[PDB]
């Protein structure tokens, strides 16, 4: 009976759908606070890069939750908060399971083909743009000199070491970092050609050294990475004729 | 094989202002 | 020198009643990423106590270790730029005039007929080791 409700037990009820509503809150800055390289060393680039992403989701509730005074009842938040109840209930339990780096990528790129939602689309959409920062910056460095760069990350690390003895193709083993079943996943081209061609011709620039749609904007990534491939691969054939 | 290279580089020039046309793109998104 | 500007910002708003508990908590956000970067850095620099260019070497695995958060980084590689400006500075008399400068093994050197190899390593400049030899 302490307070429920001036109007009969009433806040009993209703205040218990906005505790659990903010008791999604705390888990996401639970999250986002255990997931950091300063407070941790076991958790990928690309774990690390979907929290950069959260965490200015975070400073938008801060800065919303900041300006409800004057509040007149308890109805006129829950109803402003209204459409972002399903926001949050949404954002906090698609990685609690528990997916990692390329798979939490995986989770996150099929999260983001999700639309029929028009105000969690962008804002999964702006979590795609954050998460491939890091694993498109390790793109254009293998494709364009050949360097690996991760010390740590959820993609396997592969040495290819060459013996001096034997020529074979400069590098004498490679297998693969996803051996048979090779599943690289839910960046654009969507991973199942180009990812095998931004293998062989990150293997030949380094023989070169030493002598409205999550689709369409993925379409729109896709070609260009076709179209630099093949410029690559067009500078090979023509070191191939030349030596 | 130099004025095959600078037809090359070229095509990558064309992609760059591409890639700019594309972020232009998403910047009206 | 620059988080005493944003305090005193703060307590010029303090000139009357304007603040509760949880509106200058929103106002510290920005800087809580930054103060914690940098005490993650200053508290790796004393446990070891790295000298001079694998220093260098623990700020880049440090900047490496940080990748994401693109607004974050930018400060840190200002942190690592500003650590290797005295490094730089003593490199271009041993690469562009032959007669180093060195405080106290502020470069690595050996001092200089069949006279010695003059190999040294001691600093260790975090890239590769082609540039080192060269």
């Given at each position: 009976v302490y307070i429920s409700g001036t109007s009969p037990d009433n806040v009993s009820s209703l205040l218990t759908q906005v505790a659990e509503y903010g008791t999604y809150y705390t888990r996401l800055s639970h999250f986002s606070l255990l997931t950091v390289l300063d407070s941790s060393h076991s958790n990928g680039l690309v774990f690390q890069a979907f929290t950069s992403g959260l965490r200015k989701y975070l400073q938008y509730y801060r800065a919303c939750v900041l300006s409800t005074?004057?509040?007149?009842?308890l109805l006129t938040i829950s109803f402003l908060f209204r459409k972002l109840g399903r926001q949050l209930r949404y954002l906090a339990?698609?990685?609690?399971?528990?997916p990692t780096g390329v798979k939490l990528l995986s989770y996150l790129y099929k999260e983001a083909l999700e639309n029929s939602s028009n105000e969690n689309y962008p804002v999964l959409l702006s979590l795609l743009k954050t998460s491939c920062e890091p694993y498109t910056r390790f793109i254009y460095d293998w494709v364009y000199s050949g360097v690996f760069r991760d010390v740590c990350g959820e993609f396997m690390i592969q040495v290819n070491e060459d013996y001096?003895?034997?020529?074979?193709?400069?590098?004498?083993?490679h297998g693969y970092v996803?051996?048979?079943?090779?599943?690289?996943?839910?960046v654009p081209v969507f991973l199942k050609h180009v990812a095998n061609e931004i293998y062989i011709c990150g293997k030949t620039i380094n023989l070169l050294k030493l002598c409205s749609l999550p689709v369409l904007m993925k379409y729109s990534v896709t070609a260009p990475m076709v179209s630099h491939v093949y410029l690559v691969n067009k500078a090979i054939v023509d070191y191939y004729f030349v030596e | 094989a130099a004025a095959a290279a600078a037809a090359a580089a070229a095509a990558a020039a064309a992609a760059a202002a591409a890639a700019a046309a594309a972020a232009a793109a998403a910047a009206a998104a | 020198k620059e988080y005493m500007i944003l305090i005193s910002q703060l307590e010029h708003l303090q000139r009357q009643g304007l603040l509760s508990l949880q509106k200058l908590w929103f106002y510290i956000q920005p800087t809580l990423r930054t103060m914690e970067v940098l005490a993650s850095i200053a508290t790796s620099l004393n446990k070891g106590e790295c000298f001079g260019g694998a220093t260098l070497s623990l700020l880049h695995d440090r900047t490496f270790g940080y990748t994401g958060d693109s607004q974050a980084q930018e400060l840190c590689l200002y942190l690592t730029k500003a650590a290797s400006a005295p490094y730089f500075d003593i490199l271009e008399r041993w690469i562009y005039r032959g007669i180093i400068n060195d405080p106290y093994s502020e470069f690595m050197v050996e001092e200089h007929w069949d006279?010695?190899?003059?190999?040294?390593?001691?600093?260790?400049?975090?890239?590769?080791?082609k540039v080192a030899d060269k």
């Open positions: 005074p004057a509040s007149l009842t339990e698609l990685c609690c399971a528990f001096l003895g034997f020529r074979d193709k400069r590098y004498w083993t996803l051996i048979s079943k090779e599943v690289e996943d839910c | - | 006279q010695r190899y003059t190999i040294v390593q001691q600093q260790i400049p975090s890239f590769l080791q």
